[PDB]
């Protein structure tokens, strides 16, 4: 009926607008595109919003930073959405890894490293990722750890240098005491280069990717081997009997959060 047709038109047009904004989010418009993704209720379709976020982090290895600053902007207020994004990236990383999918594992590790640098993903989960990649390091898994580290070596080494020491020692052992080739040799060499350079070629977050205050953010820890769930079925809409009440709630919350 009229309420159902209104809900369907809302779902459709809002989803199209939110997808356009997620692919439109820039660095010179991170705050502006964040306020535009907020002006429409990003929480009504939080499943589909985090799905657009995951798509941005996956399909573009070069815009994972923008999706990351957006995830931080949206999680420092609503940690549940960025939390779903973290669960989805954990699912995608475990999928790429467990199924030997180089590209998907690499993209999901890109999103997770961007999260660990944006201070939305904890150090124990990054430790678990680096350890599972370096458990039986081959060219592929060691290089995956190397790509993760080329971006997230600042967060782990500045928050908990124990991670840096463990990473360096384990790398030295598994790449100097096992039948590893010039591939893993040069991956370890790139690792040592990034380390000794003091992480100047890749900071935690470039200008515009981390602007939230010290404790005014949200760093939730959902693990890799913990039985997380994607909860992305919400990317398909659903009828709402209380669309009016919940809509007033979301609109007033958007007013109180801007």
């Amino acid at each position: 009926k009229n309420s159902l047709a209104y809900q369907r038109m809302s779902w459709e047009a809002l989803k199209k607008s939110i997808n356009g904004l997620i692919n439109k989010v820039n660095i010179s418009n991170i705050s502006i595109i964040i306020q535009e993704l907020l002006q429409e209720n990003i929480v009504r379709g939080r499943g589909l919003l985090s799905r657009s976020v995951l798509q941005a982090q996956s399909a573009s290895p070069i815009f994972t930073h923008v999706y990351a600053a957006l995830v931080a902007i949206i999680n420092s207020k609503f940690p549940q959405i960025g939390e779903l994004i973290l669960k989805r990236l954990i699912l995608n990383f475990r999928k790429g890894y467990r199924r030997n999918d180089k590209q998907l594992c690499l993209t999901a590790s890109k999103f997770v490293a961007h999260l660990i640098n944006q201070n939305v993903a904890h150090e124990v989960l990054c430790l678990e990722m680096l350890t599972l990649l370096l458990e039986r390091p081959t060219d592929d898994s060691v290089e995956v750890a190397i790509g993760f580290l080329k971006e997230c070596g600042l967060k782990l080494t500045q928050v908990s240098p124990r991670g840096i020491n463990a990473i360096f020692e384990r790398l030295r052992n598994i790449l100097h005491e096992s039948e590893i080739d010039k591939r893993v040799q040069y991956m370890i060499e790139v690792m040592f280069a990034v380390r000794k350079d003091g992480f100047k070629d890749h900071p935690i977050i470039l200008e515009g990717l981390d602007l939230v205050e010290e404790d005014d953010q949200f760093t939730h820890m959902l693990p890799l081997e913990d039985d997380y769930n994607p909860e992305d079925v919400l990317n398909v809409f659903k009828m709402d009997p209380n669309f009016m009440e919940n809509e007033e709630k979301y609109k007033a919350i958007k007013k109180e959060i801007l």
């Binding site: 240098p161 020491n165 360096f168 790398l171 030295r172 790449l175 100097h176 005491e177 039948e179 590893i180 080739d181 040799q185 040069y186 370890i188 060499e189 690792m191 040592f192 380390r195 000794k196």
Partner: protein, 56 residues
């Protein structure tokens, strides 16, 4: 020979401790080598008197 003595900052961390100042070994080479390594599964055993020379 230029002496390389690394002044510490705090008394907290252990004495022997890899310092950030030192350059990471990250020694890399070819498939490194294999040894005249006398593999086990033949025999060898330590008489349960001897130990790391002083582990107390």
């Amino acid at each position: 020979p230029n002496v390389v003595f690394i002044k510490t900052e705090d008394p907290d961390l252990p004495a022997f401790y890899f310092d950030p100042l030192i350059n990471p070994i990250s020694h890399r080479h070819s498939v490194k080598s294999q040894e005249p390594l006398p593999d086990d599964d033949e025999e060898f055993e330590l008489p349960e008197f001897v130990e790391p020379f002083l582990k107390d």
